[PDB]
Amino acid sequence: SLIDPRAIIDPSARLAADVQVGPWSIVGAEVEIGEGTVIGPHVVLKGPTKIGKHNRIYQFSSVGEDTPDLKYKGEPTRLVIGDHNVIREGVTIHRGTVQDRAETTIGDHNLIMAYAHIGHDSVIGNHCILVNNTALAGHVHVDDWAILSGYTLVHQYCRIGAHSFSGMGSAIGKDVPAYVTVFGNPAEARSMNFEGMRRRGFSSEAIHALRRAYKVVYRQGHTVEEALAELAESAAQFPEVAVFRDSIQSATRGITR
Amino acid sequence: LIDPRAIIDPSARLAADVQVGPWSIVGAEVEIGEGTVIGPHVVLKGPTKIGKHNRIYQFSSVGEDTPDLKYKGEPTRLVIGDHNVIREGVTIHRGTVQDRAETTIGDHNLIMAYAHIGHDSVIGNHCILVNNTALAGHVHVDDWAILSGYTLVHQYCRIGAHSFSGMGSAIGKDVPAYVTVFGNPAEARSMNFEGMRRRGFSSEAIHALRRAYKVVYRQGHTVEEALAELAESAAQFPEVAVFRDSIQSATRGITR
Amino acid sequence: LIDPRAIIDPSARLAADVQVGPWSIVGAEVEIGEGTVIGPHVVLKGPTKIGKHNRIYQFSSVGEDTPDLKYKGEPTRLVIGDHNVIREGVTIHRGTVQDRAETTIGDHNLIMAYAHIGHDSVIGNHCILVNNTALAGHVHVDDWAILSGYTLVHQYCRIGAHSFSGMGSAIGKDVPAYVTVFGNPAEARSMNFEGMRRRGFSSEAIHALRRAYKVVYRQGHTVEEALAELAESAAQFPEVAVFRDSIQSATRGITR
Ligand SMILES: CCCCCCC[C@@H](O)CC(=O)O[C@H]1[C@H](O)[C@@H](CO)O[C@H](OP(=O)(O)OP(=O)(O)OC[C@H]2O[C@@H](n3ccc(=O)[nH]c3=O)[C@H](O)[C@@H]2O)[C@@H]1NC(C)=O
Ligand SMILES: CCCCCCC[C@@H](O)CC(=O)O[C@H]1[C@H](O)[C@@H](CO)O[C@H](OP(=O)(O)OP(=O)(O)OC[C@H]2O[C@@H](n3ccc(=O)[nH]c3=O)[C@H](O)[C@@H]2O)[C@@H]1NC(C)=O
DSSP labels, chain B: -B-TTSEE-TT-EE-TT-EE-TT-EE-TTEEE-TT-EE-TT-EE-SSEEE-SS-EE-TT-EEEEPPP-SS------EEEE-SS-EE-TT-EEE---TTTTSEEEE-SS-EE-TT-EE-TT-EE-SS-EE-TT-EE-SS-EE-TT-EE-TT-EE-TT-EE-TT-EE-TT-EE-SBBPTTEEEETTTTEEEEE-HHHHHHTT--HHHHHHHHHHHHHHHSS---HHHHHHHHHHHHHH-HHHHHHHHHHHT-TT-B--
Q: What SS3 class is residue A38?
A: strand
**What's the order of all strands across the beta sheet hosting A123-124?**
A14-15, A31-33, A49-51, A78-81, A103-106, A123-124, A141-142, A159-160
Count the neighbouring beta carbons within 10 Å of the beta carbon of residue C137.
23
Domain C1-190 bears CATH identifier 3.30.450.40: no
Inspect the interface and report whether the beta carbons of A60 and C59 lie closer than 8 Å.
yes
Q: What SS3 class is residue A188?
A: strand
In chain C, residues with a C-beta closer than 8 Å to the C-beta of B59 are 41, 59, 89
| Listed residue (B113, B106, B61) closest to B87, CA to CA | B113
Would strands B179-182 and B170-171 be described as parallel, antiparallel, or unpaired? unpaired
Method used to solve the structure: X-ray
DSSP labels, C38-85: E-SS-EE-SSEEE-SS-EE-TT-EEEEPP--TT--S---EEEE-SS-E
Whether residue A93 lies within 8 A of chain B, CB to CB, comes out as no
Q: What SS3 class is residue A133?
A: coil
- The CA distances from residue B211 to A75, B176, B214, B243, in Å, are 43, 14, 5, 11
How far is C209 from C203, CA to CA, in rounded Å?
A: 10
In chain C, residues with a C-beta closer than 8 Å to the C-beta of A41 are 25, 43
Examine the residue annotation and report whether C68 is marked as an active-site residue of this protein: no
Inspect the interface and report whether the beta carbons of B150 and A153 lie closer than 8 Å.
yes
CA-only gyration radius of chain C, Å? 19
Resolution in A: 2.3
Q: What SS3 class is residue A224?
A: helix
How far is A214 from A107, CA to CA, in rounded Å?
A: 28
| B47 close to B32: Cβ distance less than 8 angstroms | no
CA-only gyration radius of chain B, Å? 20
| Listed residue (B216, B205, B178) closest to B194, CA to CA | B178
Establish whether residue A138 lines the binding site of ligand 1, counting it when its CB lies within 6 angstroms of any ligand atom: yes
- Please identify, in words, the CATH class of the domain defined by A1-191: mainly beta
Q: Where in chain B is the domain with CATH 1.20.1180.10?
A: 191-256
How far is A52 from A74, CA to CA, in rounded Å?
A: 24
Which helix (H) or strand (E) is C147 found in, with range? strand C146-147
Q: Where in chain A is the domain with CATH 1.20.1180.10?
A: 192-257
Question: Which residue is closest in CA terms to ligand 1's atom 11?
Answer: A69
Nearest CB partner across the interface for C41, out of B41, B91, B168 = B41
The residues in C 176-215 lying below 8 A from A, measured between CB atoms, are 184
Count the neighbouring beta carbons within 10 Å of the beta carbon of residue A190.
15
- The CA distances from residue A169 to C116, C130, C154, in Å, are 15, 17, 11
Which helix (H) or strand (E) is A249 found in, with range? helix A239-249
| Type of residue at B94 | R
The residues, ordered by sequence, that sit 6+ positions from A37 with a Cβ below 8 Å of its Cβ are A16, A19, A20, A51, A52, A53, A54, A55, A56, A57
Size of interface B-C (CB pairs under 8 A): 62
Q: Looking at chain C, which subunits does it touch, using at least 3 CB pairs closer than 8 Å as the criterion?
A: A, B
Which neighbouring-strand residues pair with C173?
Answer: none
8-state DSSP, C138 = S
> Best mutation site among C155, C159, C171, C184 for ligand 2, i.e. most ligand atoms within 8 A of its Cβ?
C155
Helices (H), chain C: 193-198, 203-217, 223-236, 238-248
* CATH T-level topology, domain A192-257: Udp N-acetylglucosamine O-acyltransferase; Domain 2 (1.20.1180)
∠ CA C101-C104-C106, rounded to 5° = 160
List phi, psi (to 5°) of C13: -130, 120
Whether residue B23 lies within 8 A of chain C, CB to CB, comes out as yes
Tell how far CA A21 is from the center of its chain: 25
How far is C80 from C82, CA to CA, in rounded Å?
A: 7
In chain C, residues with a C-beta closer than 8 Å to the C-beta of B9 are none
Omega into A11 within 30° of 0, i.e. cis?
no
* CATH T-level topology, domain B191-256: Udp N-acetylglucosamine O-acyltransferase; Domain 2 (1.20.1180)
Burial class (CB in 10 A: 0-12, 13-18, 19+), C68: middle
- Angle of the A204-218 helix axis to the A224-237 helix axis, nearest 10: 170
Which neighbouring-strand residues pair with B79?
Answer: B49, B104
- The CA distances from residue C92 to B58, B146, C76, C85, in Å, are 21, 32, 13, 13
